[PDB]
Ligand binder design. Structure first.
Ligand SMILES: *[C@@H]1O[C@H](CO)[C@@H](O)[C@H](O)[C@H]1NC(C)=O
Lengths: 52, 441
């Protein structure tokens, strides 16, 4: 077991709308984006973002 | 003095209350959970990892034949290939042209990585629930200790004895079977030991990473060595662990409801906002001061100077007062209509003080307790400007919290008018019915 340096994707641009979060993702490499609700239904989302 | 109440199972949101001991001035009590940990009981079923295929030197029998024997090795394979004529660097190895046999042997072992790169399959049963509780009361600074959320085991926090009731919800994010790999936990109904299929998660199963009895189920098949070459070729189904690591999917860390945070040492689900938590705290008798020894507050008048029903402390109010024996006096709002930011204020013989509060009501109406006295605060609150915020709501929204005075007026007009229409029709029917009766009589 060792410590490896993993890439850190660019910070997303975040825009806010009524009950909506808009993220503009500009990755350098295929970057995994995951989200989940904090309620009784997680409604998870999982997708790899390869391009803006 | 024992104070009993029920607080919501929220982390980072402090619970505030006034401990009212008859004959003594109220003592402000604030209980905040630092973390909540659901720690289930787990039994390691087996360990899965990438297999290694060990292939001992083949037995090349020249001008003769050999026979394979069974051995206690995982997925052991042995086959005698007749009619071989191998060649080495030094020329033909055997003399006879076809009366020679090569016996190939191969078996499965745990790879070196299995010490570090392996998945642990666990059976999960109901365990225990623990929490870190931060408590402050009166003039006593914040003190904290680890407690058991079971309603039985008492905890001593800053001379105060705290008993935290069991969670109202027995919900747990772990199923009866989980797989722990690295820092991630997966709800996976892994195959029973000895039942793992080739090329699947359980293709390689070991009761522990250091056991001397390994289960291996791979289609390890010895192939005939190429003409004239001394080697042991074989075909085998690619590691189902490597396959699994590709197709693991979303871990429980990313799909657990209620915002649970999964930790592994010990395996637990942290900060799950499920249900509420009954509490009982015995405050030291030395923390209470007699009523006659504390300031008397009167002529309270509360004016809301600004208010927005934001998730932060968007409300601001100013309270005018008259008092005596200038000194500190606790502030509390017993109803859920508004959450007060300040816990206490300094009162002079006369003047006014301000406090901040958070409310979800469009027309908040809440009682404010100023130690031995109380005042009613009323006002209007504007909508918040920020669509999204990075902090949880301090207040609680009720069914009628959003109904404005105008909406109530329309509801009153609707119901009052609608009812009057039916009432008037029924009265008219009754009046005519009586007139018809008097006509006959
Ligand atoms: C308890 O709360 C106070 C104030 O919020 C803070 O200073 C203290 O560090 C908290 N305790 C822990 C264990 O974080």
């Amino acid at each position: 077991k060792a410590k490896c340096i993993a890439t850190l994707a660019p910070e997303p641009l975040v825009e806010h709308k009524h009950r909506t979060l808009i993220l503009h993702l500009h990755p350098d490499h295929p970057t995994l984006l995951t989200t989940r609700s904090l309620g009784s239904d997680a409604n998870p989302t999982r997708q790899w973002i390869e391009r803006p | 003095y024992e104070h009993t109440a029920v607080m919501p199972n929220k982390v980072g949101i402090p619970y505030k209350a006034l401990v009212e001991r008859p004959g003594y001035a109220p003592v402000h009590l604030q209980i905040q959970l630092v973390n909540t940990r659901i720690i289930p009981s787990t039994n390691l079923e087996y360990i899965t990892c990438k297999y290694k295929t060990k292939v001992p030197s083949p037995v090349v029998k020249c001008c003769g034949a050999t026979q394979c024997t069974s051995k206690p090795h995982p997925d052991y394979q042995c086959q005698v290939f007749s009619g071989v004529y191998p060649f080495m660097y030094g020329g033909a190895y055997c003399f006879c042209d076809t009366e020679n046999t090569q016996m190939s042997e191969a078996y499965v072992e745990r790879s070196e990585e299995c010490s570090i790169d392996h998945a642990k399959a666990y059976k999960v049963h109901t365990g225990t629930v623990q929490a870190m509780v931060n408590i402050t009361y009166g003039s006593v600074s914040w003190r904290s200790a680890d407690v058991y959320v079971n309603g039985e085991t008492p905890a001593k926090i800053g001379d105060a004895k705290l008993i935290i009731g069991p969670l109202s919800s027995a919900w747990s994010p772990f199923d009866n079977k989980v797989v722990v790999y690295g820092h991630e936990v997966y709800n996976y109904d892994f195959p029973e030991y000895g039942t793992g299929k080739a090329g699947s998660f359980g293709d390689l199963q070991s009761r522990t990473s250091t056991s001397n009895d390994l289960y291996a189920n791979t289609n390890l098949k010895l192939q005939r060595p190429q003409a004239g070459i001394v080697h042991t070729p074989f075909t085998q189904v690619p590691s189902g662990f490597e396959r699994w690591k590709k197709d693991k999917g979303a871990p429980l860390n990313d799909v657990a409801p209620f915002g649970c945070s999964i930790a592994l040492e010990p395996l637990r689900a942290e900060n799950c906002a499920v249900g509420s938590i009954p509490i009982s705290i015995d405050i030291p008798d030395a923390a209470f001061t007699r009523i006659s020894e504390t300031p008397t507050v009167s002529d309270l008048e509360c004016k809301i100077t600004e208010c927005t029903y934001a998730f932060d402390f968007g409300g601001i109010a100013t309270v005018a007062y008259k008092s005596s024996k200038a000194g500190n006096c606790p502030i509390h709002s017993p109803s859920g209509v508004a959450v007060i930011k300040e816990n206490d204020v300094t009162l002079a013989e006369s003047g006014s003080f301000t406090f901040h509060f958070s409310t979800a009501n469009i027309h908040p109406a809440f009682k404010l307790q100023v130690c031995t006295s109380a005042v009613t605060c009323k006002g209007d609150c504007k909508p918040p400007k920020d669509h999204i915020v990075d902090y949880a709501a301090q207040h609680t929204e009720s069914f009628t919290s959003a109904i404005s005075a105008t909406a109530w007026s329309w509801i009153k007009v609707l119901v009052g008018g609608t009812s009057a229409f039916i009432v008037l029709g029924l009265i008219a029917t009754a009046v005519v019915a009586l007139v018809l009766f008097f006509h006959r009589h």
